[PDB]
Amino acid sequence: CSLDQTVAPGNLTLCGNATLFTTFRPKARFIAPEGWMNAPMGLYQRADGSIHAGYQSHPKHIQWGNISQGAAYSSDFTSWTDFNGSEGYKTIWPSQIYDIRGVFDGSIIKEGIDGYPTILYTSTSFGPLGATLNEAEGTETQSLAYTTDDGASWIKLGYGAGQNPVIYEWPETNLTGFRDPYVFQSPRLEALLANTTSITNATGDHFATISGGVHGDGARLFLYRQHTTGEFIKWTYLGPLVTTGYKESYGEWSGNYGINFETAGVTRLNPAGAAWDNGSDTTAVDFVTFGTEQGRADHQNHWPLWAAVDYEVRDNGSIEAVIAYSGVQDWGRSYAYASFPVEGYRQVSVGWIYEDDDNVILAKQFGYQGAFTLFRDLFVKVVENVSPSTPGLFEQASWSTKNSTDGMSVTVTTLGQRVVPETLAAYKGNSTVSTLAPVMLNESAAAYTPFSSQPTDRFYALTGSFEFGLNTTAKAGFRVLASEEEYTDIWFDPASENLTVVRTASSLIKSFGNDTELAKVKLYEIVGAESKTLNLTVFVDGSVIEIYANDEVALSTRAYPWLANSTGAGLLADGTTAGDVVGVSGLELWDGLVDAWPARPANTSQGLVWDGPTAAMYGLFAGY
Amino acid sequence: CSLDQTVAPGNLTLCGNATLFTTFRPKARFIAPEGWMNAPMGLYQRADGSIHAGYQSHPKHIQWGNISQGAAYSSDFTSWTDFNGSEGYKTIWPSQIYDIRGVFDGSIIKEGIDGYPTILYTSTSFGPLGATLNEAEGTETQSLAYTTDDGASWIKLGYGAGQNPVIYEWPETNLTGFRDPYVFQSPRLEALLANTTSITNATGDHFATISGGVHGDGARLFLYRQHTTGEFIKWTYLGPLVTTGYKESYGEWSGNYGINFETAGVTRLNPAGAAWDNGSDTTAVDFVTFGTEQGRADHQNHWPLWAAVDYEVRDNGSIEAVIAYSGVQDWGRSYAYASFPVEGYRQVSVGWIYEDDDNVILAKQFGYQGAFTLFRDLFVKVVENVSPSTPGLFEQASWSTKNSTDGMSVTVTTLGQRVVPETLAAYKGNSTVSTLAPVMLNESAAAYTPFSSQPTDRFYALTGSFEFGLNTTAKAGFRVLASEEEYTDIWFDPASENLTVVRTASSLIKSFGNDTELAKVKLYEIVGAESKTLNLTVFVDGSVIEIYANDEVALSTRAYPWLANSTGAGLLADGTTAGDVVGVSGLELWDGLVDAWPARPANTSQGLVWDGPTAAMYGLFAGY
Numbered sequence A, B: 001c002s003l004d005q006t007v008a009p010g011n012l013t014l015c016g017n018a019t020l021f022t023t024f025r026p027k028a029r030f031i032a033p034e035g036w037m038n039a040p041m042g043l044y045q046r047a048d049g050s051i052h053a054g055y056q057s058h059p060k061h062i063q064w065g066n067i068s069q070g071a072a073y074s075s076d077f078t079s080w081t082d083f084n085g086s087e088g089y090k091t092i093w094p095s096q097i098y099d100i101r102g103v104f105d106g107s108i109i110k111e112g113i114d115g116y117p118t119i120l121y122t123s124t125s126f127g128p129l130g131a132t133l134n135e136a137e138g139t140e141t142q143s144l145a146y147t148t149d150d151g152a153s154w155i156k157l158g159y160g161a162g163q164n165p166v167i168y169e170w171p172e173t174n175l176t177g178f179r180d181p182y183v184f185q186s187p188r189l190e191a192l193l194a195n196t197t198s199i200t201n202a203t204g205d206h207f208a209t210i211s212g213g214v215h216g217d218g219a220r221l222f223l224y225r226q227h228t229t230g231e232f233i234k235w236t237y238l239g240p241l242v243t244t245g246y247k248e249s250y251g252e253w254s255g256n257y258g259i260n261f262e263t264a265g266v267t268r269l270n271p272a273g274a275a276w277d278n279g280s281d282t283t284a285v286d287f288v289t290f291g292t293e294q295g296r297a298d299h300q301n302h303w304p305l306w307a308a309v310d311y312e313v314r315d316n317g318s319i320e321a322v323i324a325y326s327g328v329q330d331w332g333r334s335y336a337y338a339s340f341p342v343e344g345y346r347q348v349s350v351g352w353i354y355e356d357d358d359n360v361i362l363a364k365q366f367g368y369q370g371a372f373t374l375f376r377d378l379f380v381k382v383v384e385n386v387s388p389s390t391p392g393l394f395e396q397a398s399w400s401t402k403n404s405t406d407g408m409s410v411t412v413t414t415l416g417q418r419v420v421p422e423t424l425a426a427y428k429g430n431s432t433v434s435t436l437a438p439v440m441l442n443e444s445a446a447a448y449t450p451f452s453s454q455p456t457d458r459f460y461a462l463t464g465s466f467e468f469g470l471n472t473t474a475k476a477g478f479r480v481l482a483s484e485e486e487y488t489d490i491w492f493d494p495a496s497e498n499l500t501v502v503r504t505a506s507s508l509i510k511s512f513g514n515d516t517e518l519a520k521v522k523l524y525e526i527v528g529a530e531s532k533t534l535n536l537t538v539f540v541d542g543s544v545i546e547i548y549a550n551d552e553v554a555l556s557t558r559a560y561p562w563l564a565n566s567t568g569a570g571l572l573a574d575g576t577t578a579g580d581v582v583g584v585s586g587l588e589l590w591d592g593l594v595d596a597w598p599a600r601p602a603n604t605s606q607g608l609v610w611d612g613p614t615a616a617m618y619g620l621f622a623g624y
């Protein structure tokens, strides 16, 4: 095939394996060296302060299978180094009857077996596995392994009675799933349960949730408690923590709860970050983050959600997490968010961005699939002095409201997300930074106005503050990865409250997805203000477009323009007039970002392989 | 429990694990250090002249499961040393999706991958597996591994296309089984196929059989040929080598062909041992040895058989092995015979002797199950100058006859088996040998006459030649493991041609088997003789009783007397009179035999373990 990016693309399906390896590939973020990746796993801050990140991995293939933990480490979330051992960059792989079908997601007990960091993970064996299939007990169990070398290798507990797997009995019949154990400490839950520990005999300092659901009756998050402090074999089932209905939706701001949960976690946050109080901090909020499946017509039937919850203690010594309000962690092509504690009272979240090639047309030509999102600090976002005339404000859909004593202003609380400052500092410092003059978008505004400085490649960031009239019908935003013939348009339309990514012209290559992305964004109007403001930040990284609005709304998507010069960026304006003006300020472009994998050459493909005719016989993995 | 062997046994089911480890345990033969063992596998003579023996092994359990290769070596078939590596005495174990359900039987390519000894073995995965179940393609495949350290460890080929497993497609639909690859070189088969290699393109110097059958339509031995010399991935299916009918029997001397073959092998022998001619040696005979299942009402539904065959070349470049005559390799509690070449033009065979505790009542108390037989030289047994008035002679059931030119005498040919001379020499040399005076059994003979010298423990051998009148109705034999209250009786009754082992009084412990064993023995009468002779040799080794008659008939069984003094032996006589006399000569007792595992302590138990509740969930292994 021809790789001439100055002319229209040919038939790229004729290209060899990994011939398009560098063409669309992110450079400034976490990604496997090659092949298939999906969910983050095994995330923890090591004793030396560095971050260990695992991920679901299938090297030398471009579909899921033999799923293993690949791993790497970083001192700043931003520049990474691969582990290299006897299995390359893998550190846990299928090896025993109980996990031979896949080492699924798992999470870290920092002070575990013999004092070592310990992973509790879903060990899978044979049989139908899935929320739409007739799964049986044993197919998904939960197992332990520990590391004596800070994540370079893991030792599994032995197979058998009183050893691995450590959790195998289904807590209810007819489960849709039983996976993704999330281990956490919780002074809050310990305080709530302290008066009931005689009922259950579970007194350990670690809790674990397991994600699943019940056939025909919606998703479930099951809560376990470590039976005894310092002992890791026995985990006592308390009860369902979160119970939702079959394809239940809390509404337009909240996705859909589907039929089954995946990768659920539990945290507690306050306005500064992570909160480790027992309930005494009145500014702190309990949150659950979770994926749902089969409640969405597109995006691989997957919603990455979160909910604020109020805990109630049941008479049998378990906890009901009652949903107070419910939102979306990312509105685009991402899923499988994991969060973990970081020193300085932080909780950091990261997810997986899948490709937009669902028919698997150019995956072999790429030689890889998937990347992470950026790493995000979670916190309680608080907006003070909100005007009660903010449209829709008292729906309290994915936020809560608290009136002032006099009823004239409102305090809004919701989940905040922002890129970790280490990454922003490194990006800015390594980039060519252009601080741009403010622009009034009025009757003279073109549909597209290129920035006065332009990117030089597909690795850049941009930010801007868009000030709108309170009754505007104008739209504005950013165009990125743009030439005359290919471009991706990011619009906000305050009248509809919709942030969209229009991808009809994103690429000349017709096999990639081109559906319009959509997020809801609430501009909380401030008392006394005669305008409302959207702070919009965009990261462009190969084919990833990752959008953040108001440290609250995130939308990750993909664009694969063919032409070498489809790298431009600028401002979008629609329906701006002399009377309906959009003021854009705080404009800045960072060109270049950071080389996130400095030790890797440009092409880390090792080729692709086929599992052969037995893949279809076993029926577990696609085989390629 | 009480282990007082001077009084009646108590309730031994109350005894702890491995508390009866030494009580009944063989000392003079090949046996695992502890736990479950079954079939011999991976047998070969190493470059240094020593013998490598593998076996199906499940350490720390007393039922089958996670089946692996345990291994040991010997310079004389008799004194053995265990391998000791990272997995103890195991050297191959389930580790990959293709073999995670068990590393089943396999055999050796001496000059294989990169010139190293290479095993071709049955790699098993998930799904129904068995001749009475609905097995599917993929559940049993055939895979390669090689050793760079003379059997201390094995490296498997990688999983995938053009790698492991190397044989996976079923040659016919609806197989009852597809396992136990037997690799061999054959100048005979090469010569037969040389004119047809254009039809199949298979020209390699190794052949392999795979054992199985077809549902409802009997057993099958499938023949493959290595496609190209020096290359080990591609094996071409030629056709069925042996085809038998559903529960077909050739008769009383020949067991039953059942529904499915296991552990089948192919060899060529002459009167001296192994024959490596191309067909030019007129004294050589082609043989197949094979196990059959579900054609027997007892003995675990298993027959260990052999057949002499005449090869025919089919038009499609395959071989039909037409059965000429058909016999039994061992008439007792043994199965899974494997044979292998040994320097000096020898073919040596060894099998597995199972316990007689089929309800698994005292297996945990033993802490082990199973042993090998002794190692046996195979050869063509030729008897000259046989009288045509030998009863039943021209049935030619498990032998062939060739008349002299004048029709007055017959040459008889059959399969010969004898204990390897290395073992007999070592046994005799380490024993207290008593050469006993000949005994005429007549009207004065007691039912039981103790030998003039007695054994001192349960480890001894005895031999004798019993001369009978041509029209005798007398019976005689040996009693072993004998006190007043417990004993095992080995009888030959020339009038019925039956060799029996009567075990009604073998033990005071009622849970062990007590059924009478039976073999057919043909005393070929010699021209001019006025008598007929049975040469009977018996090895007593813990609980094993292994009987050989006339270097032809073998019968392995088990006896578990409780009393410490149930060790005696002597002569049996029934219906001997002044006129019907049995002359016994060549009588000799070897007391002690050899310590076959000199580096092992008396108790090599490591305890027993339970796999836990997941064993029943996975449904593959009993779990204990």
Ligand SMILES: *[C@@H]1O[C@H](CO)[C@@H](O[C@@H]2O[C@H](CO)[C@@H](O[C@@H]3O[C@H](CO[C@H]4O[C@H](CO[C@H]5O[C@H](CO)[C@@H](O)[C@H](O)[C@@H]5O[C@H]5O[C@H](CO)[C@@H](O)[C@H](O)[C@@H]5O)[C@@H](O)[C@H](O[C@H]5O[C@H](CO)[C@@H](O)[C@H](O)[C@@H]5O)[C@@H]4O)[C@@H](O)[C@H](O[C@H]4O[C@H](CO)[C@@H](O)[C@H](O)[C@@H]4O[C@H]4O[C@H](CO)[C@@H](O)[C@H](O)[C@@H]4O[C@H]4O[C@H](CO)[C@@H](O)[C@H](O)[C@@H]4O)[C@@H]3O)[C@H](O)[C@H]2NC(C)=O)[C@H](O)[C@H]1NC(C)=O
Residues within 6 Å of the ligand: A092, A093, A095, A096, A097, A113, A114, A154, A155, A156, A157, A158, A159, B066, B068, B085, B086, B087, B090, B093, B094, B095
């Ligand atoms: C079917 O059969 C399968 C095969 O048998 C079976 O799988 C095997 O299961 C067994 C049993 O569970 C596993 O055995 C365990 O192994 C653990 C260590 O595992 C790691 O290391 C081994 C060995 O590594 C050596 O060899 C390899 C290979 O050559 C080398 O690469 C290594 O470098 C290393 O080499 C050195 O050592 C060799 C000899 O050992 C030398 O020959 C060599 O020269 C070198 O010097 C690896 O093989 C393992 O790899 C495999 O597993 C990993 C995942 O873990 C995979 O990723 C990988 O691909 C492989 O598959 C692995 O790296 C042991 O720790 C463990 O022993 C502990 O537990 C048992 C009980 O379960 C105790 O009896 C024992 O005492 C140990 O417990 C003590 O120690 C720990 C801390 O160390 C404590 O937590 C514990 O409390 C206890 O303490 C006690 O003692 C203390 C005294 O110090 C005292 O203070 C305490 O108070 C207390 O009393 C166990 O041996 C085996 O690994 C499996 N093998 C494989 C290949 O899978 C499978 O399950 C079966 N399936 C079924 C269904 O039945």
Ligand SMILES: *[C@@H]1O[C@H](CO)[C@@H](O[C@@H]2O[C@H](CO)[C@@H](O[C@@H]3O[C@H](CO[C@H]4O[C@H](CO[C@H]5O[C@H](CO)[C@@H](O)[C@H](O)[C@@H]5O[C@H]5O[C@H](CO)[C@@H](O)[C@H](O)[C@@H]5O)[C@@H](O)[C@H](O[C@H]5O[C@H](CO)[C@@H](O)[C@H](O)[C@@H]5O)[C@@H]4O)[C@@H](O)[C@H](O[C@H]4O[C@H](CO)[C@@H](O)[C@H](O)[C@@H]4O[C@H]4O[C@H](CO)[C@@H](O)[C@H](O)[C@@H]4O[C@H]4O[C@H](CO)[C@@H](O)[C@H](O)[C@@H]4O)[C@@H]3O)[C@H](O)[C@H]2NC(C)=O)[C@H](O)[C@H]1NC(C)=O
Residues within 6 Å of the ligand: A066, A068, A085, A086, A087, A090, A093, A094, A095, B092, B093, B095, B096, B097, B113, B114, B154, B155, B156, B157, B158, B159
């Ligand atoms: C799901 O994922 C699973 C995990 O990824 C996956 O299983 C893995 O599959 C891969 C791919 O098939 C296997 O990789 C192969 O490994 C073979 C060696 O295997 C043995 O050794 C390894 C490594 O041993 C080191 O590490 C262990 C663990 O720490 C130590 O115990 C050892 O002591 C040793 O340690 C040293 O080295 C380390 C680094 O390597 C150092 O860190 C350390 O300090 C030490 O110095 C073991 O791990 C293996 O154990 C496992 O497997 C055994 C059974 O085999 C089990 O019993 C055991 O329990 C474990 O499970 C094992 O002992 C390699 O030989 C092989 O590489 C060859 O093939 C590939 C292609 O397939 C070629 O690319 C490569 O070039 C090699 O081929 C050349 O060499 C051979 C001869 O050596 C030739 O025959 C061949 O023609 C070719 O020659 C070429 O080069 C020549 C130049 O010299 C030239 O002359 C020729 O012309 C030609 O060009 C391959 O790497 C891996 O072992 C599996 N791992 C496990 C744990 O199972 C699984 O399949 C997946 N499942 C699915 C469904 O997808």
Ligand SMILES: *[C@@H]1O[C@H](CO)[C@@H](O[C@@H]2O[C@H](CO)[C@@H](O[C@@H]3O[C@H](CO[C@H]4O[C@H](CO)[C@@H](O)[C@H](O[C@H]5O[C@H](CO)[C@@H](O)[C@H](O)[C@@H]5O)[C@@H]4O)[C@@H](O)[C@H](O[C@H]4O[C@H](CO)[C@@H](O)[C@H](O)[C@@H]4O)[C@@H]3O)[C@H](O)[C@H]2NC(C)=O)[C@H](O)[C@H]1NC(C)=O
Residues within 6 Å of the ligand: A161, A162, B017, B364, B607, B608, B609, B610, B612, B613, B624
């Ligand atoms: C001697 O060797 C055995 C191995 O053979 C060692 O382990 C024991 O194995 C036997 C099987 O041989 C197991 O028996 C089965 O037990 C289950 C129920 O077990 C539960 O209750 C037990 C009694 O208090 C308890 O000990 C068990 O605890 C272990 O297992 C749990 C996991 O469940 C684990 O968390 C613990 O830490 C322990 O490891 C467990 O709670 C029973 O259902 C089985 O019944 C079947 O079989 C019987 C007998 O034929 C039959 O009557 C039933 O109808 C049914 O068909 C079976 O009894 C035993 O549990 C194992 N014990 C263990 C692991 O401690 C044993 O330890 C060795 N002894 C010594 C001293 O070393």
Ligand SMILES: *[C@@H]1O[C@H](CO)[C@@H](O[C@@H]2O[C@H](CO)[C@@H](O[C@@H]3O[C@H](CO[C@H]4O[C@H](CO)[C@@H](O)[C@H](O[C@H]5O[C@H](CO)[C@@H](O)[C@H](O)[C@@H]5O)[C@@H]4O)[C@@H](O)[C@H](O[C@H]4O[C@H](CO)[C@@H](O)[C@H](O)[C@@H]4O)[C@@H]3O)[C@H](O)[C@H]2NC(C)=O)[C@H](O)[C@H]1NC(C)=O
Residues within 6 Å of the ligand: A017, A364, A607, A608, A609, A610, A612, A613, A624, B161, B162
């Ligand atoms: C590029 O990367 C791929 C891995 O993705 C490398 O391997 C090839 O993978 C593809 C799948 O991506 C395989 O395609 C399938 O092939 C089978 C039929 O294969 C047979 O015929 C082939 C053509 O001549 C031949 O090459 C194969 O030989 C290999 O495998 C045998 C074992 O069977 C082995 O013994 C050999 O040594 C070889 O290793 C084999 O004989 C086909 O049935 C599949 O069809 C399905 O999918 C297609 C596509 O969607 C669809 O149209 C069908 O309807 C059906 O659903 C599929 O085409 C391919 O066989 C693999 N090739 C190999 C292993 O050589 C590939 O090698 C990499 N290229 C390079 C240059 O590195």
Ligand SMILES: *[C@@H]1O[C@H](CO)[C@@H](O[C@@H]2O[C@H](CO)[C@@H](O)[C@H](O)[C@H]2NC(C)=O)[C@H](O)[C@H]1NC(C)=O
Residues within 6 Å of the ligand: A465, A533, A534, A535, A550, A551
């Ligand atoms: C948009 O971003 C601006 C700039 O960061 C935010 O304004 C700042 O608000 C903080 C208080 O939290 C002040 O300390 C700064 O001085 C403000 N800077 C200004 C006004 O330039 C603004 O709050 C953001 N708006 C939204 C809606 O998120």
Ligand SMILES: *[C@@H]1O[C@H](CO)[C@@H](O[C@@H]2O[C@H](CO)[C@@H](O)[C@H](O)[C@H]2NC(C)=O)[C@H](O)[C@H]1NC(C)=O
Residues within 6 Å of the ligand: B465, B533, B534, B535, B550, B551
């Ligand atoms: C029983 O054993 C005896 C002793 O080994 C066998 O008799 C020997 O036969 C060989 C010929 O093959 C002679 O060289 C020996 O001298 C014979 N010894 C004798 C008669 O004492 C005898 O053939 C065996 N009989 C059977 C039926 O197997």
Ligand SMILES: *[C@@H]1O[C@H](CO)[C@@H](O)[C@H](O)[C@H]1NC(C)=O
Residues within 6 Å of the ligand: A005, A006, A007, A483, A484, A485, A563, A565
């Ligand atoms: C970019 O490339 C295309 C195709 O080579 C060309 O037509 C166009 O003029 C170039 N420059 C742009 C769009 O600014």
Ligand SMILES: *[C@@H]1O[C@H](CO)[C@@H](O)[C@H](O)[C@H]1NC(C)=O
Residues within 6 Å of the ligand: A237, A238, A239, A240, A314, A316, A318
């Ligand atoms: C505790 O009660 C809740 C609510 O009825 C129930 O769902 C849960 O299963 C119970 N926990 C147990 C039985 O451990």
Ligand SMILES: *[C@@H]1O[C@H](CO)[C@@H](O)[C@H](O)[C@H]1NC(C)=O
Residues within 6 Å of the ligand: A388, A403, A407, A408
């Ligand atoms: C909150 O304030 C709004 C606006 O003043 C008012 O309509 C509403 O009733 C108030 N809610 C409460 C609980 O006082």
Ligand SMILES: *[C@@H]1O[C@H](CO)[C@@H](O)[C@H](O)[C@H]1NC(C)=O
Residues within 6 Å of the ligand: A076, A078, A079, A425, A426, A427, A428, A429, A430, A594
């Ligand atoms: C550039 O990036 C590296 C890697 O993250 C970072 O450590 C470094 O501080 C950055 N350089 C700057 C900020 O000048």
Ligand SMILES: *[C@@H]1O[C@H](CO)[C@@H](O)[C@H](O)[C@H]1NC(C)=O
Residues within 6 Å of the ligand: A439, A440, A441, A442, A443, A444, A445
């Ligand atoms: C309208 O927009 C253009 C471009 O920003 C600017 O030059 C002009 O001053 C604006 N008009 C007013 C009245 O500010």
Ligand SMILES: *[C@@H]1O[C@H](CO)[C@@H](O)[C@H](O)[C@H]1NC(C)=O
Residues within 6 Å of the ligand: B005, B006, B007, B483, B484, B485, B563, B565
């Ligand atoms: C052997 O032991 C039993 C039981 O202790 C005893 O009755 C008998 O007399 C002993 N001696 C024999 C049978 O020669």
Ligand SMILES: *[C@@H]1O[C@H](CO)[C@@H](O)[C@H](O)[C@H]1NC(C)=O
Residues within 6 Å of the ligand: B011, B013, B014
């Ligand atoms: C032997 O003990 C077992 C328990 O292992 C008991 O069930 C059985 O009834 C006992 N047999 C007796 C007393 O005969």
Ligand SMILES: *[C@@H]1O[C@H](CO)[C@@H](O)[C@H](O)[C@H]1NC(C)=O
Residues within 6 Å of the ligand: B237, B238, B239, B240, B314, B316, B318
């Ligand atoms: C060769 O012919 C025999 C007899 O018909 C048949 O059983 C066998 O399958 C054939 N071999 C092939 C098709 O490879």
Ligand SMILES: *[C@@H]1O[C@H](CO)[C@@H](O)[C@H](O)[C@H]1NC(C)=O
Residues within 6 Å of the ligand: B388, B403, B407, B408
């Ligand atoms: C073989 O010899 C027996 C006895 O003399 C005779 O009955 C039979 O017919 C002979 N067979 C042949 C083929 O000559």
Ligand SMILES: *[C@@H]1O[C@H](CO)[C@@H](O)[C@H](O)[C@H]1NC(C)=O
Residues within 6 Å of the ligand: B076, B078, B079, B425, B426, B427, B428, B429, B430, B594
């Ligand atoms: C005793 O047994 C050993 C082990 O087989 C053997 O090598 C040795 O030669 C024997 N001793 C003799 C025959 O005196």
